[PDB]
Amino acid sequence: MYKHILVAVDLSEESPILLKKAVGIAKRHDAKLSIIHVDVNFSDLYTGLIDVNMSQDRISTETQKALLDLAESVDYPISEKLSGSGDLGQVLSDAIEQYDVDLLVTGHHQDFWSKLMSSTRQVMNTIKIDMLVVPLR
Amino acid sequence: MYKHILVAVDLSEESPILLKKAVGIAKRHDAKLSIIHVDVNFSDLYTGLIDVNMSSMQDRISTETQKALLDLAESVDYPISEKLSGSGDLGQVLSDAIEQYDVDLLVTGHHQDFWSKLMSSTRQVMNTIKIDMLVVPLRD
Incomplete structure (x- = not known):
């Protein structure tokens, strides 16, 4: 069974729904659940992986609140609240490794997929864990 | 809860691994499990899906590819519902099967290729379907 699920979100209307779906999976697997906000801007200023509860300005007060608000939108405990920018292949690979994630859950948004x-x-990154791509609902 | 899972195998030596993962999921959901092999080709040359189960029953099996699909399905420790084959665009062929057979979970595998690829x-x-899709890494 999964031990740690990571949901990648862009903090849009899609996100709360995606998170509710992941909570369902986490409850069945008795897994830890974390969230990572993904910045899809192509600016390369101060890029990287950030743990929002253990912090920059790359992350803004606006996105900061929105991510903390999303995590509080479910009762299920959220282990890590991350934010990533820059090369997303590198950022996600790092988050998966660093936090021992075994299921990556994503939405359908085009800009996210383009990034x-x-x-x-x-x-030469790759993904060595399962990934669940969730359709629009 | 899933009612019908479709696993797309590439017929590589790692296919059993993908099948075992899919069975584990089917048991948890008490769902039907079907298998499909897509011969990756140009979209313009797609002629429709082939019901390999039906072919078998009518002695129409002509390719080693179809035979391998039947052989693989038979080895699975789970009752297999559909056994399908198609030649064309991956999303094109899978989308068609998903729609025709009321599939609600698509399972696909990859060999840990370059991230962006x-x-x-x-x-x-993803852009051709409207259901959940689990993408599974296959190693060694």
Whole structure:
């Protein structure tokens, strides 16, 4: 069974629904559940992986509140609240490794997928865990 | 709760791994489990789905590919519902099967290829469907 699920969100209307769905999976697997806000801007200023409860301005007060609000939208405990920017292949690979994630859950948004498809060859990343891609609902 | 899972196998030596993962899920949901193999080809040359189960029953099995699909399905420790084959665009062929057989979970596998290549192929399939899709890594 899964031990730690990570839901990638862009903090849109889609996110709360995606999180509710992941909570359902977490409850069946008795798994830890974490969330990572993904910045899809192509700016390369202060990029990287951030733990929002253990912090920059790359993350804004606006997005900061929205992510904390999303986590409080379900009763299920949220273990890590992260934010990633820059090369998303590298950022997600790092979050999965660092936090021992075994299920990555994502939505359907096009800009998010375009960013994931732009990960570079600088490091030949791959995904070594299951990934559940969730349709629009 | 899922009622019908479809696993798309690439017929590589790691296919059993993908099948075992899919069975584990089918048991948990008490769901039907079907199998499909898509011969990746140009979209313009797609002629429709092939019911390999029906072919078998009418002695129409002609390709080693179809035979391998039947052989693989028979080895699975779970009752298999549909056994399908198609040649064309991955999302095109899978979307068709999903629609025709009321599938609610699609399971696909990859061999841990370069991140962006994987995500690009995944998105292509994702944009042709309206159901959950589990993308599974296959190693060694």
